[PDB]
Amino acid sequence: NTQSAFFMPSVNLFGAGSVNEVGTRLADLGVKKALLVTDAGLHGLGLSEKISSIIRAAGVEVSIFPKAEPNPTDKNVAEGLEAYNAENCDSIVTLGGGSSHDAGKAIALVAANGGKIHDYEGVDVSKEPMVPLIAINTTAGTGSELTKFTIITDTERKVKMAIVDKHVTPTLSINDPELMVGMPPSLTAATGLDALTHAIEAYVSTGATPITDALAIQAIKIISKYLPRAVANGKDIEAREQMAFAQSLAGMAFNNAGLGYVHAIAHQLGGFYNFPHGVCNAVLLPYVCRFNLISKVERYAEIAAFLGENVDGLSTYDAAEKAIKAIERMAKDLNIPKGFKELGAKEEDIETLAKNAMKDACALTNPRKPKLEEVIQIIKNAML
Amino acid sequence: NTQSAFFMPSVNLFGAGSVNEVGTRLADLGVKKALLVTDAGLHGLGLSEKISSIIRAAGVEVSIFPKAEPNPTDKNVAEGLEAYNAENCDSIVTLGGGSSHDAGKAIALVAANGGKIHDYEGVDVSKEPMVPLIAINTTAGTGSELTKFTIITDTERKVKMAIVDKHVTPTLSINDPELMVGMPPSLTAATGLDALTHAIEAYVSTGATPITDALAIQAIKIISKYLPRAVANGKDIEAREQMAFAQSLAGMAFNNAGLGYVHAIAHQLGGFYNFPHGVCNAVLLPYVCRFNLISKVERYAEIAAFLGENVDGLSTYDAAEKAIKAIERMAKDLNIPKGFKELGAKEEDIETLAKNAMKDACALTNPRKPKLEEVIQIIKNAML
Amino acid sequence: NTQSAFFMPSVNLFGAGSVNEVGTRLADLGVKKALLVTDAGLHGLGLSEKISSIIRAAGVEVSIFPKAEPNPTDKNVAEGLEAYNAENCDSIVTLGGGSSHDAGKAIALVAANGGKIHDYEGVDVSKEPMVPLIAINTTAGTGSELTKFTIITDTERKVKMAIVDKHVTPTLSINDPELMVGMPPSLTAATGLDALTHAIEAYVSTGATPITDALAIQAIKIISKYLPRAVANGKDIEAREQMAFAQSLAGMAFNNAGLGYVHAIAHQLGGFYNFPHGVCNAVLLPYVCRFNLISKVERYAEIAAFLGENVDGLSTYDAAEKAIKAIERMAKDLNIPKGFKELGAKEEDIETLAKNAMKDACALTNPRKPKLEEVIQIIKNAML
Amino acid sequence: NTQSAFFMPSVNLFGAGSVNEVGTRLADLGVKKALLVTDAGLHGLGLSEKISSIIRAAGVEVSIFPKAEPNPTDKNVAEGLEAYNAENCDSIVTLGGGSSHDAGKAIALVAANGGKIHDYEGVDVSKEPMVPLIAINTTAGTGSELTKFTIITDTERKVKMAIVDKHVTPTLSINDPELMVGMPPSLTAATGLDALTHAIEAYVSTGATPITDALAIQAIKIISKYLPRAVANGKDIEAREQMAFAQSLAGMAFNNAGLGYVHAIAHQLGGFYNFPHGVCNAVLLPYVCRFNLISKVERYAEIAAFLGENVDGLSTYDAAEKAIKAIERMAKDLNIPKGFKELGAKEEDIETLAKNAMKDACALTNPRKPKLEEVIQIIKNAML
Ligand SMILES: [Mn+2]
Ligand SMILES: [Mn+2]
Ligand SMILES: [Mn+2]
Ligand SMILES: [Mn+2]
C-alpha cells in the first residue's frame, strides 16, 4: 500500500521567551509533580532552577534529575525511573539537548509500561502512551522535542539502540532560542550538522512524502545560510533563531520520513566510543551520500542547489557531486575532524560496527540497499 | 515578541485505505459513542454507512447526523448539539468536506464549553478543549481536519463567523484519497482553489514563519501542477493523491500563519448569498493580491515562479504581476465565474459586507492594512 | 491495474518493392484462395489486377471485390462476405487505404464469427480470430494494416462505428511506398494529418505507455518534417518513404495507447456528411487539443518542441499554446477548411453529433473527461 | 534494395500480474502438454511451481525441465529435446532469462525441423516454424521473448552461435515486473547493461530504420534514468517496471536493426570463459564505440544527449566523446570490471577470439567494417 502518517506534538511553542510558559502549560495538563530531566552541565549553570522556579510559581512541584549523560544509557533510565517513583512524580519535563529528551521519554515510557528500556527497541513495540512530558529544547539539532524516537545506549553490546514508537511523542514542545545562546562553537556545529544530516537523509529516504519534502528543503536552505553564522558568533540572535527553526523543520521531516545509513553507522560509532553524535554524522555524511548517489541522483542535484551551488549547464551527475563537495567544505569550515582514526576509533571493530549498522532501524529507509561489504567500505572510508 | 506556535493533531493518517483505521483509533481514545457528522449527499452515497460499519466493528456506537449543510449554520450546530446530547455521544467523527468538519468542531466546542457557537467568534475565546474528534476529509481543499478554525454562519447578521480557537484542533485526522475520487469537477476546482488561496494568503501573511513558508511553497507548486489534472479527470489517481497532500500542506500553513482579506471578504459574500466558499475565494484572489502587492512584492514574485511562470529579466514588480495573471488564468481554465454580479450579488450590500469584513479575524494578518473605502473598492471590482 | 499489452501483426514488410512478396507469403500460410478487397479508384487504375498477378504467380487464386468506398459502409461488408463465401475463399487480401483495410477486416471477422458487422461495435466483442488476412497499404494514413481497429459506417444511424477488437489484427502487413506515389496532394494531406492526429492523441491518451510514447514522438517529428514535402511534390520519394514509416509508427502507437475526442467527433461528422476522415481530424484537432490542455500541458509543450517550435524561456503553458499554433499553421498550409459549415454541415445536428460522439470507444482514452455541453461547444467552435 | 521488415510476437503482455494469464493463453492455442523450460535457480526458489500451477489450473499439462544453463549449450538443447519427446509435450513455456528463452526456442525449433542446433547458425536457416511458445521474462535485458534470435553455445568450437531465423519469434510474450524483484544487484546491472548495449548497437547499426531508432532512443533514455535505481534497490517497483519497458524497447530495436561488434566479440568471450553476457558487453562497449566513432559520430553525439550529458557549445566529435565517457561512468557505478584479464582471459586466445568474432552474424551490421588486426587491438585494449 501507499499509506503514510505524520506525527508531532499537538502544541509547539517557538521564539524568544517561550520557556516562561512551561509551568502554566504543565498546570493545564492537570499534573502535580514533574521530574526535571537534564544533564549535569545545564544543572551546573542554574538553568535547572530557573525552569524549576517557573514551574513552582504555577503550583506544580519539581524534582530535579540532572543525571542524563551525552549518549544517555539504560542505567541512566533505570536510575531516573527509580527517582521518578521514589519522589512520587506524575509528569516529566526534559530540559536540554537530545540526551535529556531521550532519557525523559524512556523514563516516561517505562514508567507507564513497566518493562526495561531494551524490550521496546524497534518500531511501535510498546502498548501504552507515556506519562505527560513537556520537552524544552536548548540545542540546534536532534528535534527530539518533536519525535517518536528515543536513542538509548545499550551498555553491554555498546550499541545506541533506536526505539521508534508513536507513544514517545512529547505532549508539548518548547523551542526557546534564548536558551541556545550558550552553546559553544563546537556544540553549535555538531548539533547543526546533525540537523543537516536529518534533513538530507529525510530528503533521500524511501519514506519521504511531499510534506516531509517541504520541511527538509526549507531546513537545508536555512542551515546552509545560518549555521556557519551561528558557529562564528553564538551571540548572533538571528542565526540562533533561524537554526532553531531549521532544527524543528529537520526533526519534523526525519521523524516522518525515516533516516538512512549515516545515522545507522553513527549510532554504532557513538555506542562504541561515546563520540558526539553530530560529529559522527558530519564525518559520515559525504561517504554515505556518495554511496547513495546512484539511487537518488536527481535529489542530490536538488540538494546542491539548496546548498547554494551553481548547477547551471551541468548534468544531474555533476550537480549531484557538487552537493557532496559543498557538504565537505561546510564540515571543514566548521572545524569538523577529518576522520575517525584520529578520534580514537579502532580497526578491529570495523566489521562489528558494520554488522550492527545493518540492524539499526534507520537503515530500513536508506535509498541504496548495501551488502555487508559495502557498509565495511563506508566505515573504512571514514577512517582516513 | 517574536514568539510563535505550531498547532496540529498529534496523529494524521494519509494514503489509500486510511479510513480503515478510524474504528480502532476511536477505541484507543476510550470513547464509547460518536456522533458521525456528515452532509446529505455523502450520506446518500452510503459513505456514512461504510464508516459506521468500521466504527461499530471496533465496539464503538455510532449515531449519524447527516445534516451539515454547505456553509454550516448556527442552526445546524444547535440541532447537532441536541442530537449529540439526546444520544449521549461522548465523541464526534466528521466525514466530508470543510462544512462537516466545522459543524462537528462547533458541536464539540459548544458541548464542552456551554453557551452557543456565537459566543466564541474571535481568537482563543473558549475555556475548555472540545470533545474528542476524529476528522475524515473527503475534499481536496479546506484543511479543516487539521486546523483550529471553524467557520459557522450567523443567520441573522448574514455573516460567516470565523472561530479561531486552539481548542477545536481535531484529536486525529484521516486523509483518504480514495474517498475523494468521487468529487465532481466543479467541487474539485472550488476546493482546490480554496487550498491555493490558503497557501497564498499564508505565504503573504504577517504571521508567516519559516515552517509555514516551507509548507505553503510546496502546496503552491503541487496545486500548480495537479489541480487542472484533477479537474479534467477525477479518476486520475496520481492527481488526487497530490491534491490531498497539497490541501494538507496549505492547511498546515494557514492554520499557523493566518489568512487575509480574501477570506475576510469571502466569509461575508458567503454569509449574504450562500455562494460556494472556494468560488468566492477564486473570484476575490486576484483583486486582493493586487491590493497587497506593494506590501509583499518579493513574495508575490516568488509565487509567480511557484506557479510555473518565467520571470527571467523582469523586475520584481513585473514578476508579481505575472503571478496575478497566472492566478487569473487558472481561475478561467477551471470555469470560475467572471464576477459576483452574475451570481446574485447586490451593490446595496457592499458597504455592509465591507464593514463586516473588517471584523473578521482573517483580516488581522493581511499584509496591507486597508481603510473602509479600500475594502469597498475591492468588493466593487469583484462585482464585475 | 498496472497491466498493458502491445498488439501488432507478427510480420510487417517495408520498403520499395515489398509488395512483390504477397504471393509467396500467402503460400507459406498454406492458404489457397483469397478475396482481394479494394476500392473503385485503384481498380479502375489497374492496381488490383497487377497485385492479383503477383498473387497468382505463386499458386494462390484471387477473386477481386473492388467496391469499398471512402468511409466504408455496412453494405460494403454485406456484399463482401457474399462474395467471400460464393467464391470459396480461405483468405483475404486488402489493397488500398483505410477503407480497404477496414472493409477486409470486417468481412474477415464476420466470416469467422457470423453476426452482422454492427454486432461487434465496441471493444473486444468477438470470440473467434478472423480469417487469414494480408493488408497492403497505399495511403500514408490510418495504420490499419497493423491495428486492431475497423471503422465501418452505419448507414442507418449515420454513424462511423468503431470496432476495436484484438481478433482483427491482420496476419501480415505490407508498406510499399511505391504504391503511394500516385496519391494526389489532397489525399496525401488528409491521410498525413490523420496520422498526425493518431500520433498526438496517442501521446496524450490515458493509456499511453513508454512504448507507445516512443513510437508517437517519432511519428510527430517525421510528419512535421516530411508531410509538407509530400504534399508539395508527390514524386519526392524520400518524403513518401518517411511518410510511410511515420504512418506505421503512429498506427502502432494509437493501436496500443488509444485515441481521443478528435476521432470521437470526426467519426460523427464523417458518418453524417461523408467528409474525408483526415479533413475532419485536421479541422477538429486544434479545438480538442485546447480543450485537453489543462490535462496534459506538459505533453503538449513537448509536442510543440517535436513540431519544430522554439519554446525557450517559456512557461509550460505558453509552450503548449505554441503547439496548438503550429498545428493550426500546418493545417492552413495544407489547405484544410477552417471549419465545417462551408462544407455542408448544419447547426441543427450538432447536438446529435455530440451525443453520438460520447458513445465512440475513442472517447474513453481522452485525457479530459467532458460533459455534453463541452462536446457541443467543441463542435460549435469547429463549425466556423 | 531498400527493403526492411519488423518482427515481433503478435501479443505481448506487460505489467504486474501478467503472468496470471499464462494458463488462459495456453488454452487459447489449443496445446495439450507444455514443457516448462527454466534454470536450477528459479526451480529451487519455487517459481517454476507457481507458474506450472497457473497453467495446470487451466487444463494444460506441464513437465518442468529446469536444466537450462547460463549460456545455454547444445548439450542442454539435446537433453531438452530428450525430455520434450520422452514426455510427448506439444508446447513450450520458457520462464526466466535469455538462457531459458534461447534453450526453449532451440528445443522447439529442432523439435520442428529435426536437425541439430549447430546447423541453424546463421541467418534464416530453418524450413519450418517451431512449436507453440509463450515466453515469461524475469530478467531486464535479453529481450528474447520478442526476438528471432536464439544464442546457443557450441561446446567444441567454444563459440556462442547466433541463430537469427524468422521461425523463432515466440507466439506470445509475458513481461511481469513482479517476477524481476528478486534479481540480485549484480544480475540487475549485467542484464540492464546488456539491454543498453542492444539499444546503442541498434541505434548505430547499418540496419536501423526510423522505427528501431524510435524504440532505441526511448530505451537509452529510460535505462539512463532507471538502471542505477534498480541496481541500488531491487525492491523499487517503479525502477523495475521502467527497466522492463526499456529491455523490451531494446529487444524490439536490435531484433529488427541488428547489433554489432560488441556482441560479436562478447559471444566469443562468453563461449571461451563462461563470463556473464552483460558483463562482457559492459566491458567492451566503450572500446567498440570509440572504434565506431568515425562512422556514426552524429548518432554518438545524440546518444550523449540521451544519457543526460550536456553537449552545449561542443563539436559533434566532443559530444560523441562525452557519450563514451558517460557509458564508462555508468559501468563504473554498477561495479563492472574495467578489463578482462582480471576475470581470467588469456592472450593466446585473443587471436582465436578475434577470428571467431569476424564470423558471428551480429558483425554484419556494425557501422565500421574492420580488419582482423583492428579486432585484435579491441580485445587487447579490453584487458588493463
Ligand atoms: Mn541525529
Ligand atoms: Mn478557506
Ligand atoms: Mn484516424
Ligand atoms: Mn545481448
Automatic annotation (TrEMBL), chains A, B, C, D:
A single GO molecular function term of this UniProt record: metal ion binding
EC class (word): oxidoreductase
Residues of the Alcohol dehydrogenase iron-type/glycerol dehydrogenase GldA domain: 9-177
Keywords, comma-separated and alphabetical: NAD, Oxidoreductase
One Pfam family from the record: Fe-ADH
Sequence ranges assigned to domain Fe-containing alcohol dehydrogenase-like C-terminal in this UniProt record: 188-383
Highest rank taxon of the organism: Bacteria
InterPro entries: ADH_Fe/GldA, ADH_Fe_C, ADH_Fe_CS, Alcohol_dehydrogenase_Fe
The protein's Enzyme Commission number: 1.1.1.244
Family affiliation: Belongs to the iron-containing alcohol dehydrogenase family.
Protein name: NAD-dependent methanol dehydrogenase
High-level lineage: Bacteria, Bacillati, Bacillota, Bacilli, Bacillales
